[PDB]
mmCIF file of C-alpha atoms in Angstrom:
data_model
loop_
_atom_site.group_PDB
_atom_site.id
_atom_site.type_symbol
_atom_site.label_atom_id
_atom_site.label_comp_id
_atom_site.label_asym_id
_atom_site.label_seq_id
_atom_site.Cartn_x
_atom_site.Cartn_y
_atom_site.Cartn_z
ATOM 1 C CA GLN A 1 -21.899 -15.855 15.008
ATOM 2 C CA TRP A 2 -21.731 -17.449 18.381
ATOM 3 C CA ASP A 3 -17.893 -17.085 18.600
ATOM 4 C CA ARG A 4 -18.762 -13.217 18.817
ATOM 5 C CA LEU A 5 -19.502 -13.479 22.299
ATOM 6 C CA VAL A 6 -16.147 -14.736 23.547
ATOM 7 C CA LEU A 7 -13.930 -12.015 21.688
ATOM 8 C CA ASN A 8 -14.065 -9.403 24.465
ATOM 9 C CA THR A 9 -14.027 -11.564 27.313
ATOM 10 C CA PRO A 10 -11.234 -11.486 30.053
ATOM 11 C CA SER A 11 -10.433 -15.048 29.592
ATOM 12 C CA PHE A 12 -10.847 -15.968 25.901
ATOM 13 C CA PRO A 13 -7.635 -18.076 25.461
ATOM 14 C CA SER A 14 -8.558 -20.429 28.600
ATOM 15 C CA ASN A 15 -7.185 -23.652 27.084
ATOM 16 C CA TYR A 16 -5.477 -22.579 23.886
ATOM 17 C CA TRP A 17 -1.807 -22.136 24.987
ATOM 18 C CA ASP A 18 -1.176 -18.774 23.150
ATOM 19 C CA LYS A 19 -2.305 -16.128 25.874
ATOM 20 C CA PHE A 20 -1.072 -13.066 23.762
ATOM 21 C CA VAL A 21 -3.416 -13.686 20.580
ATOM 22 C CA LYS A 22 -5.222 -10.547 21.526
ATOM 23 C CA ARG A 23 -1.800 -8.504 21.683
ATOM 24 C CA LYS A 24 -0.878 -10.007 18.253
ATOM 25 C CA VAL A 25 -4.058 -9.228 16.815
ATOM 26 C CA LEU A 26 -3.702 -5.712 17.835
ATOM 27 C CA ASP A 27 -0.299 -5.033 16.517
ATOM 28 C CA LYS A 28 -1.279 -6.852 13.215
ATOM 29 C CA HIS A 29 -4.594 -5.356 12.468
ATOM 30 C CA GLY A 30 -4.280 -2.320 14.629
ATOM 31 C CA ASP A 31 -3.116 0.126 12.377
ATOM 32 C CA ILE A 32 -5.523 -0.121 9.374
ATOM 33 C CA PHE A 33 -8.439 -0.817 11.542
ATOM 34 C CA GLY A 34 -8.048 1.666 14.507
ATOM 35 C CA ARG A 35 -6.204 0.511 17.614
ATOM 36 C CA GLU A 36 -9.128 1.848 19.681
ATOM 37 C CA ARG A 37 -11.533 -0.201 17.664
ATOM 38 C CA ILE A 38 -9.581 -3.226 17.809
ATOM 39 C CA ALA A 39 -9.193 -2.704 21.888
ATOM 40 C CA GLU A 40 -13.086 -2.390 22.117
ATOM 41 C CA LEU A 41 -13.552 -5.417 19.993
ATOM 42 C CA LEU A 42 -11.261 -7.738 22.024
ATOM 43 C CA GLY A 43 -12.051 -6.148 25.358
ATOM 44 C CA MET A 44 -8.444 -4.988 25.959
ATOM 45 C CA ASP A 45 -7.210 -1.946 28.163
ATOM 46 C CA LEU A 46 -4.635 -0.358 26.520
ATOM 47 C CA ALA A 47 -3.837 1.987 29.102
ATOM 48 C CA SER A 48 -3.232 -0.594 31.584
ATOM 49 C CA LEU B 1 2.263 6.939 -18.645
ATOM 50 C CA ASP B 2 0.819 5.823 -22.043
ATOM 51 C CA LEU B 3 4.699 6.452 -23.507
ATOM 52 C CA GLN B 4 6.146 4.380 -20.729
ATOM 53 C CA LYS B 5 3.805 1.523 -21.550
ATOM 54 C CA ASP B 6 4.769 1.824 -25.216
ATOM 55 C CA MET B 7 8.366 1.753 -24.179
ATOM 56 C CA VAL B 8 7.602 -1.292 -21.598
ATOM 57 C CA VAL B 9 6.042 -3.177 -24.809
ATOM 58 C CA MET B 10 9.233 -2.495 -26.841
ATOM 59 C CA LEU B 11 10.864 -4.149 -24.023
ATOM 60 C CA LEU B 12 8.778 -7.031 -23.680
ATOM 61 C CA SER B 13 9.270 -7.612 -27.479
ATOM 62 C CA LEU B 14 12.819 -7.784 -26.888
ATOM 63 C CA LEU B 15 12.330 -11.080 -24.683
ATOM 64 C CA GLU B 16 10.118 -12.925 -27.269
ATOM 65 C CA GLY B 17 11.570 -16.638 -27.747
ATOM 66 C CA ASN B 18 13.982 -15.762 -24.960
ATOM 67 C CA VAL B 19 15.545 -18.715 -23.144
ATOM 68 C CA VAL B 20 16.209 -19.194 -19.395
ATOM 69 C CA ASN B 21 19.243 -17.343 -18.500
ATOM 70 C CA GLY B 22 19.213 -15.681 -22.068
ATOM 71 C CA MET B 23 21.580 -13.148 -23.192
ATOM 72 C CA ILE B 24 19.016 -10.394 -23.713
ATOM 73 C CA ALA B 25 17.315 -11.176 -20.477
ATOM 74 C CA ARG B 26 20.836 -10.716 -18.696
ATOM 75 C CA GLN B 27 21.282 -7.454 -20.560
ATOM 76 C CA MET B 28 17.797 -6.274 -19.462
ATOM 77 C CA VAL B 29 18.392 -6.790 -15.945
ATOM 78 C CA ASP B 30 21.856 -5.185 -16.318
ATOM 79 C CA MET B 31 20.055 -1.979 -17.997
ATOM 80 C CA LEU B 32 17.687 -2.174 -14.991
ATOM 81 C CA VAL B 33 20.252 -2.211 -12.372
ATOM 82 C CA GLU B 34 22.016 0.533 -14.033
ATOM 83 C CA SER B 35 18.638 2.676 -13.870
ATOM 84 C CA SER B 36 18.066 1.186 -10.347
ATOM 85 C CA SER B 37 17.242 4.734 -8.623
ATOM 86 C CA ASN B 38 14.784 5.449 -11.352
ATOM 87 C CA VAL B 39 13.093 2.235 -11.443
ATOM 88 C CA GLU B 40 12.874 2.384 -7.970
ATOM 89 C CA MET B 41 11.258 5.774 -8.041
ATOM 90 C CA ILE B 42 8.331 4.543 -10.648
ATOM 91 C CA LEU B 43 7.855 1.673 -8.553
ATOM 92 C CA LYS B 44 7.560 3.721 -5.490
ATOM 93 C CA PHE B 45 5.074 5.975 -7.326
ATOM 94 C CA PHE B 46 2.921 3.135 -8.088
ATOM 95 C CA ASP B 47 2.841 1.353 -4.685
ATOM 96 C CA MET B 48 2.350 4.734 -3.013
ATOM 97 C CA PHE B 49 -1.026 5.597 -4.818
ATOM 98 C CA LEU B 50 -2.173 1.768 -4.659
ATOM 99 C CA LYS B 51 -1.621 2.122 -1.025
ATOM 100 C CA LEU B 52 -3.540 5.445 -0.861
ATOM 101 C CA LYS B 53 -6.701 4.050 -2.596
ATOM 102 C CA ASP B 54 -6.639 1.240 0.397
ATOM 103 C CA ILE B 55 -5.978 3.803 2.991
ATOM 104 C CA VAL B 56 -8.541 6.148 1.960
ATOM 105 C CA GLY B 57 -11.112 3.254 2.155
ATOM 106 C CA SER B 58 -9.767 2.011 5.556
ATOM 107 C CA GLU B 59 -11.973 2.653 8.326
ATOM 108 C CA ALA B 60 -9.371 3.846 10.759
ATOM 109 C CA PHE B 61 -8.913 6.680 7.944
ATOM 110 C CA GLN B 62 -12.627 7.544 7.903
ATOM 111 C CA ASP B 63 -12.401 8.225 11.743
ATOM 112 C CA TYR B 64 -10.711 11.591 10.675
ATOM 113 C CA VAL B 65 -13.038 12.557 7.982
ATOM 114 C CA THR B 66 -15.545 14.321 10.260
ATOM 115 C CA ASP B 67 -16.791 17.393 7.953
ATOM 116 C CA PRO B 68 -20.295 16.792 6.592
ATOM 117 C CA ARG B 69 -18.912 17.506 2.905
ATOM 118 C CA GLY B 70 -16.789 14.493 3.252
ATOM 119 C CA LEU B 71 -13.436 16.675 3.218
ATOM 120 C CA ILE B 72 -10.165 16.373 5.190
ATOM 121 C CA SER B 73 -8.142 19.202 6.379
ATOM 122 C CA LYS B 74 -4.480 19.013 5.254
ATOM 123 C CA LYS B 75 -3.661 18.604 9.240
ATOM 124 C CA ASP B 76 -6.164 15.805 9.800
ATOM 125 C CA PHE B 77 -4.984 13.973 6.487
ATOM 126 C CA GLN B 78 -1.400 14.232 7.923
ATOM 127 C CA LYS B 79 -2.531 12.621 11.203
ATOM 128 C CA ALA B 80 -4.328 10.067 9.717
ATOM 129 C CA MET B 81 -1.545 9.118 7.375
ATOM 130 C CA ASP B 82 1.093 9.173 10.402
ATOM 131 C CA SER B 83 -1.526 7.066 12.534
ATOM 132 C CA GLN B 84 -1.717 4.227 9.723
ATOM 133 C CA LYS B 85 2.124 4.112 9.957
ATOM 134 C CA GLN B 86 2.270 2.932 6.124
ATOM 135 C CA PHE B 87 4.212 5.978 4.920
ATOM 136 C CA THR B 88 7.378 8.114 5.807
ATOM 137 C CA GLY B 89 7.246 11.605 6.323
ATOM 138 C CA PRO B 90 8.601 13.005 3.207
ATOM 139 C CA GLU B 91 5.987 10.354 1.393
ATOM 140 C CA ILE B 92 3.391 12.198 3.253
ATOM 141 C CA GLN B 93 4.560 15.462 2.177
ATOM 142 C CA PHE B 94 4.363 14.435 -1.293
ATOM 143 C CA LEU B 95 1.054 13.223 -0.960
ATOM 144 C CA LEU B 96 -0.279 16.426 0.677
ATOM 145 C CA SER B 97 1.546 18.375 -2.446
ATOM 146 C CA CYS B 98 -0.410 16.067 -4.775
ATOM 147 C CA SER B 99 -3.713 16.397 -2.855
ATOM 148 C CA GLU B 100 -4.830 19.692 -4.728
ATOM 149 C CA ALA B 101 -6.202 20.937 -1.385
ATOM 150 C CA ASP B 102 -8.604 23.965 -1.625
ATOM 151 C CA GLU B 103 -8.219 27.325 -0.562
ATOM 152 C CA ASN B 104 -9.290 26.321 2.953
ATOM 153 C CA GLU B 105 -6.723 23.572 3.087
ATOM 154 C CA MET B 106 -9.470 20.653 2.538
ATOM 155 C CA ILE B 107 -8.839 17.845 0.470
ATOM 156 C CA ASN B 108 -11.487 15.647 -1.374
ATOM 157 C CA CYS B 109 -10.334 12.427 -0.418
ATOM 158 C CA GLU B 110 -11.957 10.282 -2.957
ATOM 159 C CA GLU B 111 -11.006 12.081 -5.748
ATOM 160 C CA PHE B 112 -7.411 12.214 -4.700
ATOM 161 C CA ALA B 113 -7.317 8.396 -4.056
ATOM 162 C CA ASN B 114 -9.217 7.790 -7.748
ATOM 163 C CA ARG B 115 -7.110 10.590 -9.524
ATOM 164 C CA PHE B 116 -4.239 8.173 -10.835
ATOM 165 C CA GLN B 117 -5.939 4.721 -10.542
ATOM 166 C CA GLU B 118 -6.971 4.214 -14.263
ATOM 167 C CA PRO B 119 -4.233 6.438 -15.945
ATOM 168 C CA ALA B 120 -1.572 4.172 -14.360
ATOM 169 C CA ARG B 121 -3.304 0.846 -14.945
ATOM 170 C CA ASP B 122 -1.929 -0.123 -18.239
ATOM 171 C CA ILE B 123 1.780 0.884 -17.379
ATOM 172 C CA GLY B 124 1.552 -0.689 -13.857
ATOM 173 C CA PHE B 125 0.293 -3.923 -15.399
ATOM 174 C CA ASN B 126 3.038 -3.751 -18.223
ATOM 175 C CA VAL B 127 5.615 -3.344 -15.583
ATOM 176 C CA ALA B 128 4.153 -6.303 -13.562
ATOM 177 C CA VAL B 129 4.660 -8.329 -16.488
ATOM 178 C CA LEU B 130 8.140 -7.490 -17.283
ATOM 179 C CA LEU B 131 9.219 -7.999 -13.767
ATOM 180 C CA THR B 132 7.430 -11.466 -13.869
ATOM 181 C CA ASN B 133 9.026 -12.352 -17.092
ATOM 182 C CA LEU B 134 12.574 -11.304 -16.375
ATOM 183 C CA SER B 135 12.066 -13.031 -12.899
ATOM 184 C CA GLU B 136 11.107 -16.384 -14.285
ATOM 185 C CA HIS B 137 13.691 -16.371 -17.045
ATOM 186 C CA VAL B 138 16.662 -15.209 -15.062
ATOM 187 C CA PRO B 139 15.859 -17.446 -11.752
ATOM 188 C CA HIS B 140 19.217 -16.546 -9.742
ATOM 189 C CA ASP B 141 19.653 -13.069 -9.451
ATOM 190 C CA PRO B 142 19.535 -10.945 -6.299
ATOM 191 C CA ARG B 143 19.589 -7.791 -8.367
ATOM 192 C CA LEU B 144 16.208 -8.674 -9.653
ATOM 193 C CA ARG B 145 14.885 -10.122 -6.415
#
Protein backbone atom coordinates (compact mmCIF):
# COMPACT_ATOMS: atom_id res chain seq x y z
CA GLN A 1 0.00 0.00 0.00
CA TRP A 2 2.82 2.43 0.79
CA ASP A 3 4.74 1.68 -2.41
CA ARG A 4 1.76 3.08 -4.32
CA LEU A 5 3.13 6.55 -3.49
CA VAL A 6 6.32 6.13 -5.53
CA LEU A 7 4.95 4.69 -8.78
CA ASN A 8 4.28 8.01 -10.53
CA THR A 9 7.22 9.93 -9.09
CA PRO A 10 9.72 11.33 -11.63
CA SER A 11 12.59 9.66 -9.74
CA PHE A 12 11.18 6.29 -8.70
CA PRO A 13 14.26 4.20 -9.57
CA SER A 14 16.79 6.42 -7.78
CA ASN A 15 19.09 3.74 -6.32
CA TYR A 16 18.08 0.67 -8.32
CA TRP A 17 20.20 0.53 -11.45
CA ASP A 18 17.41 -0.05 -13.99
CA LYS A 19 16.27 3.41 -15.09
CA PHE A 20 13.94 2.06 -17.81
CA VAL A 21 11.65 -0.08 -15.66
CA LYS A 22 8.77 2.24 -16.53
CA ARG A 23 9.36 1.79 -20.27
CA LYS A 24 9.64 -1.97 -19.83
CA VAL A 25 6.38 -2.11 -17.87
CA LEU A 26 4.61 0.04 -20.45
CA ASP A 27 5.78 -2.20 -23.29
CA LYS A 28 4.81 -5.36 -21.41
CA HIS A 29 1.37 -4.49 -19.99
CA GLY A 30 0.58 -1.49 -22.20
CA ASP A 31 -1.61 -3.24 -24.76
CA ILE A 32 -3.81 -5.30 -22.44
CA PHE A 33 -4.22 -2.59 -19.77
CA GLY A 34 -4.14 0.56 -21.90
CA ARG A 35 -1.08 2.63 -22.74
CA GLU A 36 -2.68 5.82 -21.44
CA ARG A 37 -3.74 4.07 -18.24
CA ILE A 38 -0.23 2.71 -17.67
CA ALA A 39 1.28 6.13 -18.39
CA GLU A 40 -1.03 7.70 -15.82
CA LEU A 41 -0.19 5.01 -13.26
CA LEU A 42 3.57 5.41 -13.75
CA GLY A 43 3.54 9.18 -14.22
CA MET A 44 5.00 9.08 -17.73
CA ASP A 45 4.60 11.65 -20.50
CA LEU A 46 4.08 9.56 -23.62
CA ALA A 47 4.38 12.48 -26.04
CA SER A 48 7.64 13.87 -24.65
CA LEU B 1 -16.75 -30.70 -32.02
CA ASP B 2 -18.14 -33.75 -30.22
CA LEU B 3 -17.18 -35.89 -33.22
CA GLN B 4 -13.67 -34.44 -33.11
CA LYS B 5 -13.47 -35.40 -29.45
CA ASP B 6 -14.51 -38.97 -30.28
CA MET B 7 -11.82 -39.21 -32.96
CA VAL B 8 -9.22 -37.89 -30.53
CA VAL B 9 -10.35 -40.44 -27.93
CA MET B 10 -9.72 -43.16 -30.51
CA LEU B 11 -6.28 -41.69 -31.19
CA LEU B 12 -5.49 -41.65 -27.47
CA SER B 13 -6.60 -45.28 -27.26
CA LEU B 14 -4.08 -46.12 -29.97
CA LEU B 15 -1.36 -44.95 -27.53
CA GLU B 16 -2.30 -47.15 -24.56
CA GLY B 17 0.76 -49.05 -23.40
CA ASN B 18 2.99 -47.13 -25.81
CA VAL B 19 6.67 -46.84 -24.89
CA VAL B 20 9.01 -43.88 -25.34
CA ASN B 21 9.81 -43.54 -29.04
CA GLY B 22 7.15 -46.13 -29.80
CA MET B 23 6.29 -47.03 -33.36
CA ILE B 24 2.64 -45.98 -33.12
CA ALA B 25 3.63 -42.69 -31.49
CA ARG B 26 6.02 -41.93 -34.34
CA GLN B 27 3.32 -42.86 -36.86
CA MET B 28 0.88 -40.50 -35.12
CA VAL B 29 3.44 -37.70 -35.31
CA ASP B 30 3.91 -38.44 -39.02
CA MET B 31 0.15 -38.25 -39.54
CA LEU B 32 0.00 -34.91 -37.73
CA VAL B 33 2.86 -33.52 -39.83
CA GLU B 34 1.02 -34.69 -42.94
CA SER B 35 -2.04 -32.79 -41.68
CA SER B 36 0.13 -29.84 -40.59
CA SER B 37 -2.05 -27.15 -42.17
CA ASN B 38 -5.33 -28.46 -40.76
CA VAL B 39 -3.87 -29.11 -37.32
CA GLU B 40 -2.59 -25.53 -37.35
CA MET B 41 -6.04 -24.27 -38.35
CA ILE B 42 -7.74 -26.17 -35.52
CA LEU B 43 -5.21 -24.95 -32.96
CA LYS B 44 -5.64 -21.41 -34.28
CA PHE B 45 -9.41 -21.68 -33.83
CA PHE B 46 -9.05 -22.69 -30.19
CA ASP B 47 -6.34 -20.10 -29.52
CA MET B 48 -8.28 -17.30 -31.20
CA PHE B 49 -11.39 -17.80 -29.13
CA LEU B 50 -9.55 -18.40 -25.85
CA LYS B 51 -7.79 -15.09 -26.49
CA LEU B 52 -11.08 -13.39 -27.36
CA LYS B 53 -12.52 -14.34 -23.98
CA ASP B 54 -9.58 -12.65 -22.25
CA ILE B 55 -9.53 -9.55 -24.44
CA VAL B 56 -13.24 -8.89 -23.92
CA GLY B 57 -12.65 -8.89 -20.17
CA SER B 58 -9.53 -6.75 -20.44
CA GLU B 59 -9.96 -3.16 -19.28
CA ALA B 60 -8.33 -1.66 -22.38
CA PHE B 61 -11.10 -3.33 -24.39
CA GLN B 62 -13.89 -1.98 -22.17
CA ASP B 63 -12.63 1.54 -22.93
CA TYR B 64 -14.33 1.17 -26.32
CA VAL B 65 -17.62 -0.21 -24.97
CA THR B 66 -19.28 3.16 -24.35
CA ASP B 67 -22.89 2.49 -25.35
CA PRO B 68 -25.22 2.11 -22.33
CA ARG B 69 -26.48 -1.31 -23.46
CA GLY B 70 -22.94 -2.68 -23.43
CA LEU B 71 -22.75 -3.34 -27.18
CA ILE B 72 -19.87 -2.30 -29.42
CA SER B 73 -20.06 -1.15 -33.02
CA LYS B 74 -18.15 -3.16 -35.60
CA LYS B 75 -15.77 -0.26 -36.23
CA ASP B 76 -15.08 0.21 -32.52
CA PHE B 77 -14.55 -3.54 -32.12
CA GLN B 78 -12.06 -3.39 -34.99
CA LYS B 79 -10.28 -0.48 -33.31
CA ALA B 80 -10.12 -2.25 -29.95
CA MET B 81 -8.71 -5.43 -31.48
CA ASP B 82 -6.17 -3.40 -33.46
CA SER B 83 -5.05 -1.60 -30.30
CA GLN B 84 -4.69 -4.86 -28.38
CA LYS B 85 -2.06 -5.95 -30.94
CA GLN B 86 -2.99 -9.60 -30.41
CA PHE B 87 -4.59 -10.49 -33.77
CA THR B 88 -3.74 -10.10 -37.43
CA GLY B 89 -5.98 -8.23 -39.85
CA PRO B 90 -7.46 -11.38 -41.36
CA GLU B 91 -8.08 -12.77 -37.88
CA ILE B 92 -9.96 -9.63 -36.87
CA GLN B 93 -11.99 -9.87 -40.08
CA PHE B 94 -12.87 -13.47 -39.22
CA LEU B 95 -13.87 -12.44 -35.70
CA LEU B 96 -16.07 -9.68 -37.10
CA SER B 97 -17.70 -12.20 -39.44
CA CYS B 98 -18.42 -14.50 -36.48
CA SER B 99 -19.58 -11.65 -34.21
CA GLU B 100 -23.22 -11.87 -35.41
CA ALA B 101 -23.47 -8.10 -35.53
CA ASP B 102 -27.03 -6.81 -35.46
CA GLU B 103 -28.66 -4.70 -38.17
CA ASN B 104 -27.14 -1.57 -36.57
CA GLU B 105 -23.65 -3.15 -36.72
CA MET B 106 -23.63 -3.56 -32.93
CA ILE B 107 -22.04 -6.61 -31.30
CA ASN B 108 -22.91 -8.21 -27.97
CA CYS B 109 -19.35 -8.76 -26.82
CA GLU B 110 -20.32 -10.86 -23.79
CA GLU B 111 -22.29 -13.39 -25.83
CA PHE B 112 -19.66 -13.35 -28.57
CA ALA B 113 -16.91 -14.18 -26.08
CA ASN B 114 -18.92 -16.91 -24.36
CA ARG B 115 -20.46 -18.53 -27.45
CA PHE B 116 -17.74 -21.12 -28.16
CA GLN B 117 -16.27 -21.59 -24.67
CA GLU B 118 -18.25 -24.61 -23.46
CA PRO B 119 -18.87 -26.26 -26.85
CA ALA B 120 -15.12 -26.43 -27.50
CA ARG B 121 -13.98 -27.31 -23.97
CA ASP B 122 -13.91 -31.10 -24.33
CA ILE B 123 -12.17 -31.25 -27.71
CA GLY B 124 -9.72 -28.59 -26.55
CA PHE B 125 -8.80 -30.56 -23.45
CA ASN B 126 -8.45 -33.76 -25.46
CA VAL B 127 -6.19 -32.03 -27.99
CA ALA B 128 -4.06 -30.79 -25.11
CA VAL B 129 -3.88 -34.32 -23.71
CA LEU B 130 -2.93 -35.76 -27.10
CA LEU B 131 -0.17 -33.20 -27.61
CA THR B 132 1.17 -33.72 -24.09
CA ASN B 133 1.18 -37.51 -24.46
CA LEU B 134 2.94 -37.38 -27.82
CA SER B 135 5.44 -34.79 -26.63
CA GLU B 136 6.37 -36.81 -23.56
CA HIS B 137 6.68 -40.09 -25.46
CA VAL B 138 8.58 -38.72 -28.48
CA PRO B 139 10.96 -36.34 -26.69
CA HIS B 140 13.19 -35.32 -29.63
CA ASP B 141 11.01 -34.16 -32.50
CA PRO B 142 11.03 -30.53 -33.73
CA ARG B 143 8.00 -31.32 -35.87
CA LEU B 144 6.08 -31.92 -32.63
CA ARG B 145 7.81 -28.95 -31.01
